[PDB]
Amino acid sequence: LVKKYILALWNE
Amino acid sequence: GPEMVRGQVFDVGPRYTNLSYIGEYGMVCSAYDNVNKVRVAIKKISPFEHQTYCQRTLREIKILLRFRHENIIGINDIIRAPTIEQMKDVYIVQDLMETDLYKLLKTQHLSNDHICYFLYQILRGLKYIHSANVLHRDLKPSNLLLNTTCDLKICDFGLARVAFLTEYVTRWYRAPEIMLGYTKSIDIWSVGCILAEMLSNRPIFPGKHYLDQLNHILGILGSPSQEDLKARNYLLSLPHKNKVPWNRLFPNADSKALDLLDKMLTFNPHKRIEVEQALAHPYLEQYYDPSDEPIAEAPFKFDMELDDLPKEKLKELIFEETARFQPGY
Ligand SMILES: Nc1ncnc2c1c(I)cn2[C@@H]1O[C@H](CO)[C@@H](O)[C@H]1O
């Protein structure tokens, strides 16, 4: 159970 | 010693270390905090040699100090010299972020769920600052930092004013009244342009001057109603055009979002939608929670802000606002 959704996009 | 990096000195004291140059008011670096044991972002700003320099940094320092929000960047610490005379540089220490939206919109694509979520965090955060009767004036994808866990924060409060304009400005996100704009609605336009850019992965209104930006909008928004001096005569001379359907530029986009996008990107500032209203839009029902979303406790009061003062007095104002963070005081 982890809200706020799970994706890290990523690097600059 | 002073932990000099790149070309110039970066004296942040023993508190921060392992400086890494990020890029870019002034130089921006990523240091390691030892007091909180977590990497932070420090930006070196060296003003005091210009009229509008001391204002925007004071304007940004003040506002960010009295604001607290999950979607607005916050100053963790400020470092400078103990005395007025030796104070030439200011170090704004803020929490570190992985990227911003400009770096995001390029090389990467967002799903409708990710687009909706970001626009929400923009609006959720915007409605706080707007609740305090303060204008961001310059909203950009580059001013929207992004946390690793898809959390959005807003920066660049230098050009902020309460509810010279022309001074140093990416003019792709200006409102039709800021062509050459003093209300909440001028920020919505920018946020509208951003949504259009998140939806197309490209700038909705390219070119940063009159022959393009206010000319390309005519290609999409069309000729204005007669509700709408040298900018006046120029538009009337230009041939009549029609509004190209939002479902032609964005055919693979959400029907909900396109409705909101059109409500945000209307020509005239009057009835150009409002915050909270945009939050109530069907496109944002999965996230909208007015019971949790914080608002301003009180409008940004006056008398303390009237920056027609000389640079000499502004430096003094910086000193007072910064003394709250100075280690010994
Ligand atoms: N607080 C922060 N945390 C992490 N990075 C930051 C900041 C700040 I203030 C600025 N930047 C870096 O500067 C770029 C500005 O578009 C950003 O994209 C970013 O590279």
Structure description:
The complex is a heterodimer of chains A (12) and B (329). With 12 residues, chain A is low in regular secondary structure. Chain A has no helix or strand. Chain B has 2 domains: 1-96 and 310-327, Phosphorylase Kinase, domain 1; 97-309, Orthogonal Bundle (Transferase(Phosphotransferase), domain 1), CATH 1.10.510. In chain B, the strands form 3 sheets. In chain B, strands 1-2-3-5-4 form a 5-stranded antiparallel sheet, with helices on one face. Chain B has a 3-stranded antiparallel sheet with strand order 6-8-9. Chain B has a two-stranded antiparallel sheet with strand order 7-10. In chain B, a hairpin with a 5-residue loop joins strand 8 and strand 9. Chains A and B meet through loops of A and strand 6 and helix 3 of B. The structure holds the ligand Nc1ncnc2c1c(I)cn2[C@@H]1O[C@H](CO)[C@@H](O)[C@H]1O. The site of the ligand Nc1ncnc2c1c(I)cn2[C@@H]1O[C@H](CO)[C@@H](O)[C@H]1O has 14 residues of chain B, from strand 3 and strand 6.
Summarize the structure.
The complex is a heterodimer of chains A (12) and B (329). Chain A is largely without helices or strands.
